[PDB]
Amino acid sequence: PWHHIENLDLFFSRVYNLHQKNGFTCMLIGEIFELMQFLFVVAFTTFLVSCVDYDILFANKVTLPDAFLPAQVCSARIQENGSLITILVIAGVFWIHRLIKFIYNICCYWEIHSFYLHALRIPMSALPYCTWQEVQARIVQTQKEHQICIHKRELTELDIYHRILRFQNYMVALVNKSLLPLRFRLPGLGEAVFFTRGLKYNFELILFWGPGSLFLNEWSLKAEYKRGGQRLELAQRLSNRILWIGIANFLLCPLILIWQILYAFFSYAEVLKREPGALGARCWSLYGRCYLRHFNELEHELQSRLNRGYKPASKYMNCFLSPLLTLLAKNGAFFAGSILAVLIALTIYDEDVLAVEHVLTTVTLLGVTVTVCRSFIPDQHMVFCPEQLLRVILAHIHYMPDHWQGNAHRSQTRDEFAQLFQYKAVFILEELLSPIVTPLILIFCLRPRALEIIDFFRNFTVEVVGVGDTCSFAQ
Amino acid sequence: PWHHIENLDLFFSRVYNLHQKNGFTCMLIGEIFELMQFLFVVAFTTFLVSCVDYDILFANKVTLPDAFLPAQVCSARIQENGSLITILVIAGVFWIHRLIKFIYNICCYWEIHSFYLHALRIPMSALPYCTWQEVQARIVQTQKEHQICIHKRELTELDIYHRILRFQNYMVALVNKSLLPLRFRLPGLGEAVFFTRGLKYNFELILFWGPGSLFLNEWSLKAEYKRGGQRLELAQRLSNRILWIGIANFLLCPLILIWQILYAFFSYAEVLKREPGALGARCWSLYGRCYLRHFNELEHELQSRLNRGYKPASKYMNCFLSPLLTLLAKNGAFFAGSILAVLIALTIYDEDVLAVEHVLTTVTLLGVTVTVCRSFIPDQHMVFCPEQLLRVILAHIHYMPDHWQGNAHRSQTRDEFAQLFQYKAVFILEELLSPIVTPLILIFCLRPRALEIIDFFRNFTVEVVGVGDTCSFAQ
Amino acid sequence: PWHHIENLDLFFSRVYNLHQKNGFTCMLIGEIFELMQFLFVVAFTTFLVSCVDYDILFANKVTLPDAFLPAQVCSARIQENGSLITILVIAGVFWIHRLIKFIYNICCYWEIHSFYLHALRIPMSALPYCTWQEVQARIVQTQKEHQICIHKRELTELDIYHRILRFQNYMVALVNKSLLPLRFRLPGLGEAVFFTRGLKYNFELILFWGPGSLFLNEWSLKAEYKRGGQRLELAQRLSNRILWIGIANFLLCPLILIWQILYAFFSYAEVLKREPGALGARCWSLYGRCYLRHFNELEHELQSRLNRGYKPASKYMNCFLSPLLTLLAKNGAFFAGSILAVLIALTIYDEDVLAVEHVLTTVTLLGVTVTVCRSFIPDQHMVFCPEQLLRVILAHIHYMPDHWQGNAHRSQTRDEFAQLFQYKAVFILEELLSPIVTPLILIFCLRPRALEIIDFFRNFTVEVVGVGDTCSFAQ
Questions:
Q1: Touching check for C306 and chain B: CB below 8 Å?
Q2: What is d(CA A1, CA A120) in angstroms, rounded to the nearest whole number?
Q3: A and B: number of Cβ contacts within 8 A
Q4: Which terminal residue of chain C has fewer beta carbons within 10 Å of its beta carbon, N or C?
């Protein structure tokens, strides 16, 4: 609750994060769980690779620990692996860096916790329900009695928004004005959109937070980028910077692939064995979280809009079905149900046609076939592909391509609403492919745009008196 | 798209059908599947009857083809069956007639496909979503460039409706004015309605398309039927025509009965073994598809109205109270749950409840009793809308009996609202009974009405300038 | 159908009750069942205690009637119990009083039947179905022919409402103006509300129907209560009356506690046995039925409003959930699904991973763990605005505290919206506690309010020309 002591963007961001992860205790536990998941993936994997004797486990009454090798031997068997030891050393260095960041992260969050309790007066018990609007009302009312900020200017409730969302408004405006290569023309497919978690991380590491970024303070643009002249040397410097960051990505490719290959397999293989159709459900597409997002919109407001409008969008995506597939389903159901009805009447009649060594199995198969076809056979209604279903999905999100409103029922509309709707299997595939795809897009497709990026940041960056250097659109 | 290359109706109907079966390819496949279903039913049945050695299959490790007899013997075993060979010859003649009609139909449908692509400019890809609306308005614009009709004003298409629906408006007006015997007074039941697929086929074969029908052209009524005189000789001729068509039906009775047998088996017996309650769901009743029809209404508009209004109608069939029972359920649940609670508290206390000769059986029977009663006990706070149910169903249908609106809750209303919405099982039964019932209704109940049918077709048949002879009501 | 034979209330109320219990035959049967439930509870209550030899039943093949003792001995064993014989004599006297009231009631309900059939012309078959408005539309039109009572007033169309609901409007206005102690401040809990069936019965027995009540006729207030003077002696007399009625309650406490014990114990426990979560569902309360009730509102209109608005209220009560647990669920699901995915991949790979010392149990326990966690994981995309919903509950209930509309999401709102909506189990507990709690509230908390009760009944009691003495608010 101190008198404007440390850079603001961070203080406010931390305050917001503490409100989101409902309370200090919850947040601390969440971070600890995040650290234990990494360590568990890595240690479980290195235990499966190195310590388990699969041959004895498989064939050659056996108790579970009959497989495992004693530690006095596991250490030697894992140590005589140069590749494994190297991956483990890099993994442990990343881990130690994350644990050290966590330490302070909590040493700096105890300060926000005391801020809440003593200056805002919202106990951690009343915080999951304290709500954002009131807190906003609390912080802005607190600004007076207790000194905070320069005091040159009193808070105005949009300052806090700019502080929390400075770099995110920049991402919104970058993606909105078609910088930042996302569209690609793949052979054998339409124009794909490839925007992942790692790619946006790299874009922010290149532009916003790094050793030689565009920003020096986290609230002020470096002095040269405001100058109209020397734009070409700045463009060359940015191009070289992004070249070398792309090369670091290309060199780290195997390790992130491993983790990506690994964590992912673990994450959904359970779900696959349970309900293989959970991966057929659709999610709201990182490109699409950035496209449908307003300028000064905190994460919880975007996500509230995005799930208020989720079931209309699933009703839309499921409303168009192939007639042909429908006809094939109907007739395959007829022929399979006919052969099965005959075989069922026989097994009912005598019961020794049952479990024909061949028949029983087919009966099931044929049963699987009839069930699949009946699932593909449409049932009555839901065929609208309506202007109206769109007319409600839009009412939620509020943005649509302008060539969508008329032809809501075509393959052009579905195909590029498809890109926003993101069925997950692809997400998981698209997050797997990002280690190997992000360096080459970063080296080839973005380096030509560096001279346009420089002109964006020079042209669209306003200095607002209290907040510093913010995007020009987010005003 | 040759100008006046044909009478308007056999062209417009085909165009409409091509829009419905979404595209030429789809339609072709659908027809092929329709031809393969007939051939499969007949060949599978004759294989089951004639080639399989059931004794070895049942009792006397055995592979499946150990049952089947070699073809060199199947041919002789199926050939030495006069009844089977005769049924197969009649079946093959009907099949060959259907295959020849199919070849002629696709040779005539390639012309409509070229019509679409070249004169309407709707590719087969944009046709499942082109929409009827698009083409119906569009052709009317084509009427200028690619001319049709020797002397044609741009098609209002109001007329075009007339072309597609000439004979169907006649059926609607026949059933609407209570010609065409449908109501019957069966002993042991109320007034049944018996209107099937075969019966309406026979009515149309008698009245509209045949060797000596009422119509000579498909768009013009024969010249004598417009004359007021000679009505009695025309009535006698129509009566003799329908007598002999009924006798043809009576002679073909065994074959159509056999057909309705096997197709259903395969079609339904599978569904019975899967979900015996799927046949308890209700369907919209061929009488009822003709009763709830609306002026000049293409099939897809009727079906859209009919399924928009399907779930309200199931909630209605579902809704009525049976109140006195409710009380019996409540109080039987009380007394049974009381005795069971005592016996349960005892078996929990000591666990030596058993050895009583009937105890355990008493607990099980009492549990069944409580569960049945609780199923009959209405759920509290379950809303009831008799007025609404007999209101929203009408809003979707738009036609109502004048004695339904007041007493929505009586057995008179349910009993005759049932016929319109009758359940699938009585549908399958009523389609089974039509081979044996259609000839006798056709001979006995319709031949007395021939003099009224003649007066209908003389009185209600207007000559509209562009379309020809249409029903007088459908104007 | 005669003229003014009985008090209008004693006629109109009966007419309304006959419409509610749909018909005379129903009403009778319901009353007979009500009489048989009392006698059945008391019977075994006494057969289980007195005639059954539990020792032989438990331990010392045995048929059920091997336990029971012969009647020649049951009579002596139940007769040599002074406490049991005394409870049975009091129970039999209450029963005989109820049976005599039942005979008198059906002898008076036949008259009413005849009223329906002959003067209203609504047969008992068309009654469950008559609908309320129609009777209203029938009785008021009948007032001309079979003249109604005095016939002083033609039907008011409100008069019937006042007649049926005279004392209930008084209860509504008493509870509405915070007479009638309901709120209590218990230690260890918030302000509890204790309003039961027995407490409201006692309030009505004290105020409305008794030997020395406020009312002498059932439609006229005693003459002294209209006088401004002598208010203090009337207050003292009312205080003494309620003191002695409270003392009668305190003396009858053991018997009502037992009966409360017996009648309740039997019913609910079995249900809990079946589904222990049925008692976690919530019901509207005697209170809350009196708080949310309009003035001249018949019981069926209140209950229609109350169940139209029941599911919104359950959605509200279930909306608040722990942030912390969620996190535990998510991460336990991760770790369990990870170990299970590994073990599943192994059992798929070789199939002999199974049959290992812990193999056929770890997979099952881990599957249960993942399923439990996934049930605790909230559905992502799940939209709950607690604040928004209360709006629909209000649209149905129609009454609310002012300080709810803003803070719909707080514990203050839930805590006192809890009182209106409390779950069954506290209902059954609160009906159990009323025998022992009603006398002390009646003696201590209401006797101080007697001088305010007298001033209420003097100030708010209007004489309306046709109906007599009605509450002043219910106008």
A1: yes
A2: 9
A3: 71
A4: C
Q: In the beta sheet, which residues pair with residue C462?
A: C470
Q: Does residue B414 sit at the C interface (CB-CB below 8 Å)?
A: no
> d(Cα C166, Cα C472) in Å, to the nearest integer?
11
B138-167: string of b/e by CB count within 10 Å (b at 16+)? Answer: bbeebbeeeebeeeeeebebebbbbbbbbb
Count, residues in chain B: 475
Query: Which residues from chain C sit within 8 angstroms of residue A304, using beta carbons?
Result: 383
SS3 C147: coil
- Interchain contact, B273 vs A344, CB within 8 Å: yes
Kindly tell me the number of DSSP H helices and DSSP E strands found in chain C: 19, 4
* Eight-state DSSP code of residue C68: S
Are residues C45 and C256 in contact, defined by beta-carbon separation less than 8 angstroms?
no
Q: Which of A89, A431, A391 lies closest to A264 in space, CA to CA?
A: A431
**What's the CA gap between B448 and B125, in Å, rounded?**
52
Six token digits for residue C34: 């009500």
Comparing CA positions, the residue from C216, C197, C347 lying closest to residue C259 is C197
Six token digits for residue A1: 């609750």
* One-letter amino acid for residue B280 of the chain: G
Q: Which of C29, C41, C270 sits opposite B337 (nearest CB)?
A: C270
How many CA atoms lie less than 13 Å away from A465 in the CB half-sphere? 7
Helix (H, G, I), strand (E, B) or coil at C124: coil
B31 touches B242 (CB < 8 A): no
* A436: Cβ contacts below 8 Å, ≥ 6 apart: A253, A257
Please name the chains neighbouring A, where neighbouring means 3+ C-beta pairs under 8 angstroms. Answer: B, C
Q: Are C199 and C434 in contact (CB under 8 A)?
A: yes
Alpha carbons A43 and B49: distance in angstroms, whole number: 66
In degrees, rounded to 5, the angle at the alpha carbon of residue B101 between the alpha carbons of residues B98 and B107 is 140
Q: Is C349 helix (H, G, I), strand (E, B) or coil?
A: helix
The CA–CA distances, whole Å, from A197 to A194, A212, A435, B70 equal: 10, 22, 10, 66
Tokens representing residue A49 in the block: 């690779």
Angle between helices A82-114 and A24-50 (to 10 degrees): 170
Type and span of the H or E element at B45: helix B24-50
Question: In Å, what is the CA distance from B199 to each residue of A56, B192, B390, B437, B444?
Answer: 74, 15, 31, 9, 14
**How far from each other are the two terminal CA atoms of chain C, in whole angstroms?**
28
- Cα(C438)–Cα(C268) distance, rounded to whole angstroms? 22
Structural biology method used:
cryo-EM
Side-chain half-sphere of C292: how many Cα atoms within 13 Å?
28
CA–CA separation, A400 and A407 (whole Å): 12
Q: How far apart are CA A241 and CA A213, in angstroms?
A: 9
Residue in A closest to B310 by C-alpha:
A380
Dist CA A349 CA C447 (whole Å) = 82
* Matching residue, tokens 């692809």: A426
Domain boundaries defined on chain C = 9-153, 175-281+426-470, 315-418
Which of A270, A273, A289 best tests the C interface by mutation, with the highest count of C CBs <10 A?
A270
d(CA A47, CA A55): 15
Helix (H) or strand (E) segment spanning residue C470 = strand C468-470
Place of tokens 């202007």: A387
Q: Say which of B41, B128, B266 has its CB closest to residue A337.
A: B266
CB proximity C33 to B under 8 Å: yes
Kindly compute the dihedral angle of the four CA atoms of residues B435, B440, B443, B449, in this order, to the nearest 10 degrees. -100
Which residue numbers come right before each break in chain A (C to N over 2.5 Å)? Answer: 60
Interface-testing mutation among C44, C130, C266, C396, with chain B (most B C-beta atoms within 10 A): C266
Measured between beta carbons, the chain C residues lying within 8 angstroms of A64 are 356-359
